[PDB]
Amino acid sequence: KVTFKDVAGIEEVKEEVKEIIEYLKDPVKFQPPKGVLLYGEPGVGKTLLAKAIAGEAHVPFISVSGSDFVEMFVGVGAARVRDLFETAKKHAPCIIFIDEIDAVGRHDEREQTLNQLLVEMDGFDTSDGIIVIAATNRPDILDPALLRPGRFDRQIFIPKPDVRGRYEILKVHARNKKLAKDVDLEFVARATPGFTGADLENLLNEAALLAARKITMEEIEEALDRITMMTISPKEKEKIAIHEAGHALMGLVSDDDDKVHKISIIPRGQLPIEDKHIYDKKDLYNKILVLLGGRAAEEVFFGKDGITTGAENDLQRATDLAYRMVSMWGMSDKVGPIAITSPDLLREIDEEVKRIITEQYEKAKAIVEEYKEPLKAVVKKLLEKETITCEEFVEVFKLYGIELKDKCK
Amino acid sequence: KVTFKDVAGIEEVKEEVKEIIEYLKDPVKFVLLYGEPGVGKTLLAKAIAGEAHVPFISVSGSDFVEMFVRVRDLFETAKKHAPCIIFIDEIDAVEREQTLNQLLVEMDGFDTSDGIIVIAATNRPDILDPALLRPGRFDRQIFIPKPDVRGRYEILKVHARNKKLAKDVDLEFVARATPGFTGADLENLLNEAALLAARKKEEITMEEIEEALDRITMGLETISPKEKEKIAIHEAGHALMGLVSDDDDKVHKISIIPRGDKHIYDKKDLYNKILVLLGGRAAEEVFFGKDGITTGAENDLQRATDLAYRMVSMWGMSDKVGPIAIDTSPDLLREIDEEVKRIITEQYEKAKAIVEEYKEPLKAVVKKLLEKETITCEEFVEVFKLYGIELKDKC
Amino acid sequence: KVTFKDVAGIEEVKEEVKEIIEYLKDPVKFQPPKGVLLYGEPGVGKTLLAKAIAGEAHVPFISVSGSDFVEMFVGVGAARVRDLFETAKKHAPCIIFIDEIDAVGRHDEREQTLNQLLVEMDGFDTSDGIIVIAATNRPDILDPALLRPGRFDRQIFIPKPDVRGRYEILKVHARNKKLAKDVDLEFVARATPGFTGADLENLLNEAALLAARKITMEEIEEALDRITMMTISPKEKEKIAIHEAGHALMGLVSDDDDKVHKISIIPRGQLPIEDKHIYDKKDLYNKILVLLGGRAAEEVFFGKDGITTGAENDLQRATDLAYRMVSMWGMSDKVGPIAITSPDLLREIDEEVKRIITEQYEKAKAIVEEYKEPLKAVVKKLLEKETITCEEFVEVFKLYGIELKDKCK
């Protein structure tokens, strides 16, 4: 059995999949939902989420793994996919769950089967009554063709749980076991930042050794320390808080930008496809400034000897974008309106890129230097809660006589 | 019954299929449609069938295999009730290899002078087999573009006539409020608001029309209007340079809607093609300034520069470099880059000066295109004549 | 039925294939002809030429396309080729026509079948009584092994028809239809430069719409304008005339060179194989000068702002050859007798190449500047006729008191 109680710490994902649940329950009543792509680190509850979606609508669950499809002989995988959809159509309504989708997605051996999969996605119309759920641990290798309309057009991220999420997951797993009264799961949630649901289940199961010898806090602590011997250290919590806080500050103070999301020491999220948009010079300057917020805050607070690697992913994108401004979009007066080479031109390009990056970085550093005290306050609140809202950020900054731009999603 | 009266917003496609209609009408004395879903492909096929007053044999490619596992019998029945049209929806879907072989062997084998024709509908043309487009095999293809303001207004009228909406409502505002919609989208919108009125009336009102429009829009939840303005200005710069060309080929109708021959050329023609490719960005900078230029010109900026290279390294059109065409020493690459920059900056200054000269008629054209989402080269020429500027009447 | 009347505009190709026709008619009487390779743009009449060769000798015609050979399973194509030659030997005498040969030619999937083809070419001796004809639209990708002796050793180009060729093709196609008296096909031929036979047939068939509504000149013109909406424009005719005229002038005035061919605004022809020859420094200088004639004439007549892209193909070869003179044949005193690197050597090579090219280009420009009036006369004649003979060129230039070298093939 898999019910709503078995999932915890992701109300947004539940709200997003309620529509698919209604689709599985009553296909007629709706007057699309075709493919749902779940992505996240291993052990975050993707297969659990699929099983829960299946059990909520009270429909069958057809589970399969791509790993056994690919590694076969010519014709095995394509016939396997075809026969799968045959079973699904015969046993309609149901969910077809394909674990490790990106590993298989990545003419040739693997390609023919994936083509069969896409032909199946396109063949079943919305009156067949079926849906397909796919889970992946490595999304960067996925083929963009899988994200086209009518073919896994909807994507969902399963972030790691914060204090509340970890507490709820602990409560969920505890039900089967008869723990002691003295235990305080809240302290456990506050003492295991950066853990996944499977990781915490491993803690509850780990205390099985203590029950074997004798569940009390002694076992929970011994098992958390054993697995640790990867909880996020408090210094790492502070660093991540300052990074996300710089991001939020730059997003809020930008002259013109898009809505800002909820702050959290948990990762923000990737897996790009067609942006299908256009941007101007100032908008790109501002996006760069945003991507440079975390590192600027790090340097301002800890100094030049404190900057961290957490901005890696960030630091890349920013610089990457800068290149697209000079070598692809001709947004440089020095270089000129030329898009694509002799060493002189590459030198000019690099000089302009460094100019842009250093300008925006000095700008971000000055911004942070101006509003250091409310930033410290926000960091304290985020540390105590591990997750705050854009509105709470605005409130903390208003407490210092600083009126920020009112743009929250 | 389905005739052209049921179809609206595609006069060009009607002109193109008039020939097939006449062929179906008179066999003795005497096709692949592609576009996004819900644009009216099956409707267009049914309309051609009803216009020629001939049977309509509908089938879906997805259903071929298990139904034909035959094509022979399908075409035999089509020939029996000839003249007629054999419509195959979901053509791309067409075990499948053998069936597709049979289908193409029939297309080439059947000397379909019995009076029958074959129409196929597809949503993704990139996945269609090119072999299907051989002579006698879907020799001509047709695209169904999305309706503009006027097109959406007409389609709204088409479906609205049957149900009699409220008196106060005026569809023109609706057409102006639904950019990027298809015909099926408008059908679902009208039917949804009538159903909502039933749930509430039997006379469907603007409030309900909005109740459904806001619902569909929320489903979309969006291109900002500023993006519309930017696309308008870009396409307008393109149209201005192409229409104002010293020497050029014909220019097509301008449009902000998503898009998704000469044998040999001379130096000036290539300069002019570059100038055309640089029009959008020049207009962007002139209007919004150096801090407003956008990424929409990306592809364009590529082609332009690309062409410049072909002018220096392949066609020897540089006096400094000389008549040498193509490992190369750094000095030669430096000379090439310097000449390319010279050409590009020269043509860009030229384009900027041109735009600076004619900014007011450009603003007027942008306004008209924004309100209409699509104007004709002739309308462009008229707007520019309204300011005492007489352009060459070449469309 | 396919007869001699169905082919028009290529008397040279007919003269070349008369031998193969005699071979098909009487195999005994001859006291080799093995493979004939036809190459040209699509719609020029390659398959029509093969069918005509088959019908003239009154022998069977075994038509097949390589496209259906390649895309099969292992063994399909090789057995297909083998069984083809089995049918040909059983049904001897006949022609084995393989359309789209280069597409298939281009161990591995495709290679095994091509090997079978070559083994068949080598296996049937001249007493089997069979021949093989191959047609291709893209010859640049063809494997040189296919052009070896006894294996498609003879090659033929099907050029586009000029005024006379287009007129004759129009007459040929007209027979089936009952056109009006007012029509003048000569004007059509003069008004459709750069068209192929299939293109013109499309014009005659296009007038079918006018016959449906009501064939008169109105329909022919409406259909030519429709298809155009690619006839060569008159300015393009002038440019091509001047290009070919510069070529002919440089070929005729060269101190030592090979015979010059007939001038025509139609393309000259490619598909290289073993040259099996040797050349000297002066001969290569002269070949370069020839390849630079068209562009020199273009600049002299229209100025530096008139040079065109028609010389593209030409401009490449010339420069390419120049490189072979310095980096492969040691024909540079500055560089020295070294054949194959530090940047200095590459710089020296490039400087010598530019020296050679600019020298020969100034030479060609001076030559043209000397004889501009007879060149204009020749261009006028070529424009009016679209094709002149080397002898007519010599006559036009003699009319101005200029005696050219008497070397015409």
Ligand SMILES: Nc1ncnc2c1ncn2[C@@H]1O[C@H](COP(=O)(O)OP(=O)(O)O)[C@@H](O)[C@H]1O
């Ligand atoms: N958010 C969560 N809430 C409750 N349990 C979870 C959660 N995430 C993971 N688990 C537990 O972890 C285990 C592995 O779940 P699974 O979905 O297979 O991991 P993944 O989807 O990351 O590969 C399950 O037994 C489940 O009980």
Ligand SMILES: Nc1ncnc2c1ncn2[C@@H]1O[C@H](COP(=O)(O)OP(=O)(O)O)[C@@H](O)[C@H]1O
């Ligand atoms: N251009 C149009 N004008 C009027 N109605 C249209 C148009 N396009 C689509 N429709 C409506 O949308 C519905 C779907 O049409 P259809 O052609 O079957 O969709 P598709 O061709 O995308 O499969 C029809 O009921 C039709 O009335």
Ligand SMILES: Nc1ncnc2c1ncn2[C@@H]1O[C@H](COP(=O)(O)OP(=O)(O)O)[C@@H](O)[C@H]1O
């Ligand atoms: N030189 C020509 N003379 C007469 N008809 C021609 C000529 N070239 C092409 N055609 C016409 O064009 C059509 C296509 O001929 P085909 O040989 O198949 O083209 P290709 O060989 O270029 O692929 C034929 O129906 C033929 O009547």
Ligand SMILES: [Zn+2]
């Ligand atoms: Zn970050």
Ligand SMILES: [Zn+2]
């Ligand atoms: Zn553009």
Ligand SMILES: [Zn+2]
């Ligand atoms: Zn040439």
